[PDB]
Design a protein around this ligand. Structure first.
Ligand SMILES: Nc1ncnc2c1ncn2[C@@H]1O[C@H](COP(=O)(O)O)[C@@H](O)[C@H]1O
Ligand SMILES: Nc1ncnc2c1ncn2[C@@H]1O[C@H](COP(=O)(O)O)[C@@H](O)[C@H]1O
Ligand SMILES: Nc1ncnc2c1ncn2[C@@H]1O[C@H](COP(=O)(O)O)[C@@H](O)[C@H]1O
Ligand SMILES: Nc1ncnc2c1ncn2[C@@H]1O[C@H](COP(=O)(O)O)[C@@H](O)[C@H]1O
Ligand SMILES: O=P(O)(O)OC[C@@H]1O[C@H](COP(=O)(O)O)[C@@H](O)[C@@H]1O
Ligand SMILES: O=P(O)(O)OC[C@@H]1O[C@H](COP(=O)(O)O)[C@@H](O)[C@@H]1O
Ligand SMILES: O=P(O)(O)OC[C@@H]1O[C@H](COP(=O)(O)O)[C@@H](O)[C@@H]1O
Ligand SMILES: O=P(O)(O)OC[C@@H]1O[C@H](COP(=O)(O)O)[C@@H](O)[C@@H]1O
Ligand SMILES: [Mn+2]
Ligand SMILES: [Mn+2]
Ligand SMILES: [Mn+2]
Ligand SMILES: [Mn+2]
Ligand SMILES: [Mn+2]
Ligand SMILES: [Mn+2]
Ligand SMILES: [Mn+2]
Ligand SMILES: [Mn+2]
Lengths: 317, 317, 317, 317
């Protein structure tokens, strides 16, 4: 009575009376993620070192060809590509997929946890597919999630019904369901932000951080954690509780994180888990994109922590 | 031509004219690390989940059994065991090994990078082996290093002639030398500390951090990173430069990190790489321990960043 | 444009407008076979040898629980179980599955190629499921095939549309389609039989063997090969051409190979590949079983070789 | 307590007081075999099949590069190379290694068991190293053995003190000693020969085979097995008992199997295990070669079965 991702995705496709097109897409994703996981953990490196006489790029190529081979997609948006990828009519399906094939790639040389992020939209309209099909607010996501290549490889999948966590068993190449209908804690005890940008923070962020270090009601201060890889920091937030923040600063007054393939998928997982995701002014899922590589500030995590910061944001309104 | 850890270790043992006792110890360690890496990556998890037919206890049991079978050790100090472990005479060798089998075990459920830390001493006084044999300053280390289970598994080994990094190719179970004679950058641009303890920081730390966020000469502030796993944070420091700090506070008036199996091995690695490892008042390696589970404050990293902080400590003295 | 088993099985389920029940069954098989493959290649043996302080049976258990977890089966027949396994009504599906979880298990200690064999029937009737549901001639098979754990792991799947070969990539745990719509050679140059039973052969087998060693028309003699594991010998027959034989002798005047889970699946693969499978008197697929563990003589392979022996069988009629 | 090949090899090199040169050679071999096993099992095949981003040539290139880098060899003889390979002086050691990188390469497409055979000689006459250095009788071997890529990967190493079997645990990339000081049964019950050459067999062989099928004393006839892969057939002989034969015929008036890298290593293994290895007229190991690619007839296995056949040869002399 063990549940594999392949079994789960199929039972769910059957409960929803799907034609099996989204099921083929999710299955292709599972496969791409397993292939990326293997390359990240360096299987075969001995060959590069001459035993018998990139990563970001290889990841992009893997996701793009495996997804195109699903015959379920029409428009693909990648952080690595300037322009959206329109699928050849022969393999054109109805889904639009937005992804960051390898997030935190700058951490690659340090061997810190990295990951893959994706958001799936249904093409809403009937004209020739194009970039415009991707420009949907995150509220229209059919599915979203991410894979974390950390001490172990995990796939977190968020759909209308909720959030589920699948652990990769690399011995048999199968994702096993380990956590069902995951719900984030109402209040955590960890805050996560790059405090190296202190001089640049707006007054509301500055004050919140201060409340966390020197609590006015004399409660225990929060612990700090900042891996520097969104997927690692968010996954920790989901599982442990707390808050993650990447607000605006000189690094663009618009934030650093990209809306379509970084913020939306994560905001979607968070909301399905019972938490919040805001830019400080509005909910991330409601922003209407105007550019596929548009950035946006984001704050996400346990609802009580997110609301507390929102209140401060109001005080400085 | 490729160099595996196995060949490198033997070659070095040949040049040093050893009786092959330390060579066996080092081969044993390598085997234990590969075994732990496999467990950490979750191979075989499907069996816990009933495809019909604890990670730190297992790790501890792997290091202990595998080290004893090397017939090269007489005293073992584990973070997991209260008293030192005296090997039976039949299996006695001349080495004392101090290790943390799985560090960052809190971070396990969140899939954050974890690692194994070890330090190797040679039995000095030949009386019946005992706990006191482990009570040697870190300056007396023969070898030290760590295994990081991050996006990929890496083993860093430091000995008198330098520091070398070996990446694990899990396809063939062999560590390949990928970085030779490693040296840390003189000056970095990342600081790593849990600022959630700001309320309890002594003045020197407070000044240094603030100097990093608001550089007097309006230069770029340092970026911040704090994984919460020493092996991860220290490895990023060695590889990319910067400074790592875990000073004394209230909950830990003498620091949290233990001297024999966390601070010493890392201080040794940092020193051979050209960095510094201080308590703020003194070099970590010169401290003569009095308890096997003793704690110590530690600041390590690029020489220029550590020196700068030390200048500040002096100023408040 | 790579085809995985998971993709293939789904497209085929969709072309056939299945409810997705047989698709879930085939997917469970893929998973069980990957798990058996891993245990056969000895992953984890170090643990049995005390690194930190059956196979036939484990295989049976794996197939039985994974199949029962598919919710697509009602009756299971295993070589390892005296009685057929009736599925608990909660997980009862409509398929009957006959399998040998690990064939050639006596070769296990010698590390010779071994394999798994299965035949799938649709329950034909409407009363309580029972052993009687399995007693269908092989001509009523919906699907049949086998997995060979040899120098590499391969899954050969035979369905109404033909035979396809899938190679297991153990790095990503995915079966990849490597040979489509496989057809056996009309005439091969290898014969396979245990000649240690010479004294026991009937006159027709005796004469055929003689024709192969000393060809009456002076053509080159055939080469001999007999691995001793049916799946290995049959797979070689399919891929290379030729004939495989296990006729009657003192080892039961009825042959050794079991009809339901050894001969039928193989006879079915052979026929779909364009070859023949006979007991010498009748086609294997047409025999009406009377016992789930009933044995039957079998001869299979390239059509021209099988007909030649059948002619001799007639001459001695 | 567990014994890995790495530890065993070093331990034996310590007891023998070697300079560690052969120890390095043996560690190199182990690494090369693990690499070949991985390629053979087809890891990464999905890449040949375009998840977008020869086995004997590769094997040959792995053994050669990996052996040269051991700095322990001066002359290499491969089944794949016409002339002996003279290592550059910079990498010269004192050992001559004769090997078949991938034996049974015909059997590759059929996924039948394949293996690697090697024999190690010590350079006797210290003149500039050359081909003649490999032309030593098998009685002069320092070490020999083979790696079998069957259902599991095994390495059999024979040296003056005996034969030991090591099973590869692919999860941790380590060979574990599983059978110590192996000895072959005195008398077996399986004979292995390609009876497809019956027409060309000399009288002695003819009589022996017929004696196996129709034992004069009406005892049980011998079972027959002929995988077609020497490593597989010879390994089953060593492990289960019996006799393996590849005598001279017409297509091969001096046998098919080569003396330096197929017959000698196996004869050496058989002898240390308590079996016999003869040409029919003489012991294989006593033959002084005159060509590096020389062929030789070979009969090996349990002493009683081999003796019996030898008695028969004598009778027809
Ligand atoms: N495996 C699945 N899991 C959950 N929902 C699914 C699945 N397949 C299809 N659906 C749902 O049904 C809709 C159409 O399915 P489809 O015909 O495959 O495009 C989707 O867009 C989802 O809303
Ligand atoms: N593998 C090696 N690598 C570096 N130094 C070695 C090695 N083996 C032995 N040595 C050194 O030589 C001393 C004695 O070696 P041993 O006889 O093996 O106990 C050791 O403590 C080290 O200082
Ligand atoms: N994946 C599949 N591949 C080939 N045929 C299928 C598949 N699924 C179902 N079928 C066929 O359709 C019938 C009923 O499918 P099902 O509703 O799943 O039981 C089967 O018994 C087959 O004949
Ligand atoms: N690992 C070992 N196992 C068994 N014998 C060894 C080992 N190492 C060296 N010897 C033996 O000692 C001789 C010289 O060793 P060496 O100095 O390494 O070249 C060898 O030829 C073998 O006879
Ligand atoms: O994948 P990218 O585009 O290289 O950047 C990773 C992102 O960069 C953020 C950290 O940026 P800072 O260094 O500015 O904190 C992380 O949350 C995100 O993963
Ligand atoms: O869980 P461990 O084995 O005690 O390790 C925790 C240690 O804890 C440090 C961080 O602790 P804080 O949460 O107090 O920052 C790390 O740098 C060390 O890995
Ligand atoms: O799986 P089993 O029941 O142990 O037997 C294997 C079978 O046994 C036959 C060989 O039997 P002989 O030794 O009689 O040739 C092979 O074709 C079959 O795989
Ligand atoms: O393909 P190779 O490397 O030449 O090996 C074939 C050899 O061939 C023998 C069998 O050959 P026959 O087909 O002539 O029996 C085996 O025993 C040896 O493995
Ligand atoms: Mn990216
Ligand atoms: Mn990114
Ligand atoms: Mn620990
Ligand atoms: Mn610790
Ligand atoms: Mn069986
Ligand atoms: Mn069987
Ligand atoms: Mn070869
Ligand atoms: Mn050969």
């Amino acid at each position: 009575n063990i549940v594999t991702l392949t079994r789960f995705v199929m039972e769910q496709g059957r409960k929803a009376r799907g034609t099996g097109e989204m099921t083929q897409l999710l299955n292709s994703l599972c496969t791409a993620v397993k292939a990326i996981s293997t390359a990240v953990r360096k299987a075969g490196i001995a060959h590069l070192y001459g035993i018998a006489g990139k990563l970001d790029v290889l990841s992009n190529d893997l996701v793009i060809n495996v997804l195109k081979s699903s015959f379920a997609t029409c428009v693909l948006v990648t952080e690595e590509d300037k322009n959206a990828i329109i699928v050849e009519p022969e393999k054109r399906g109805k889904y639009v997929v937005c992804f960051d094939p390898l997030d935190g790639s700058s951490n690659i040389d340090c061997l810190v946890s990295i990951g893959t992020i994706f958001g799936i939209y249904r093409k809403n309209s009937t004209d020739e597919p194009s970039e415009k099909d991707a420009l949907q607010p995150g509220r229209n996501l059919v599915a979203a999630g991410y894979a974390l290549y950390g001490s172990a490889t995990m796939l977190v999948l968020a759909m209308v019904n909720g959030v589920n966590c699948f652990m990769l068993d690399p011995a048999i190449g199968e994702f096993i369901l380990v956590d069902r209908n995951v719900k984030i804690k109402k209040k955590g005890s960890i805050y996560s932000i790059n405090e190296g940008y202190a001089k640049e923070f707006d007054p509301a962020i500055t004050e919140y951080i201060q409340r966390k270090k020197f609590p006015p009601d004399n409660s225990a201060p929060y612990g700090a954690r900042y891996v520097g890889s969104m997927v690692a920091d968010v996954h920790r937030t989901l599982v442990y509780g707390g808050i993650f923040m990447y607000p605006a600063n000189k690094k663009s007054p618009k934030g650093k994180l990209r809306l379509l393939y970084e913020c939306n998928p994560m905001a979607y997982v968070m909301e399905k888990a019972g938490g919040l995701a805001t830019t400080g002014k509005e909910a991330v899922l409601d922003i209407v994109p105007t550019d596929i590589h548009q950035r946006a500030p984001i704050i996400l995590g346990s609802p009580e922590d997110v609301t507390e910061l929102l209140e401060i944001y109001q005080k400085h309104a």
